[PDB]
Structure formats: structure tokens, C-alpha cells
Amino acid sequence: GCCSDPRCNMNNPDYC
């Protein structure tokens, strides 16, 4: 889950 990761969430607007 990309939403759980702060960096993933921030850099992946399509993912989360």
C-alpha cells in the first residue's frame, strides 16, 4: 500500500 508510506504518497499522486 502506497498510502501507508509518506514518501510514496507524496511522490505518487496517481498511486495515492
UniProtKB/Swiss-Prot annotation:
Tissue spec: Expressed by the venom duct.
Residue pairs linked by disulfide bridges in the UniProt entry: C2-C8, C3-C16
Family: Belongs to the conotoxin A superfamily.
Superkingdom to which the source organism belongs: Eukaryota
Domain observations: The cysteine framework is I (CC-C-C). Alpha4/7 pattern.
PTM note: Both tyrosine sulfation and C-terminal amidation are important for activity and structure stability.
Annotated positions of the Cysteine amide modification: C16
Other known facts: Does not show activity on alpha-7/CHRNA7 nAChR.
Protein name as annotated: Alpha-conotoxin EpI
Full-protein positions shown: 40 to 55 of 56
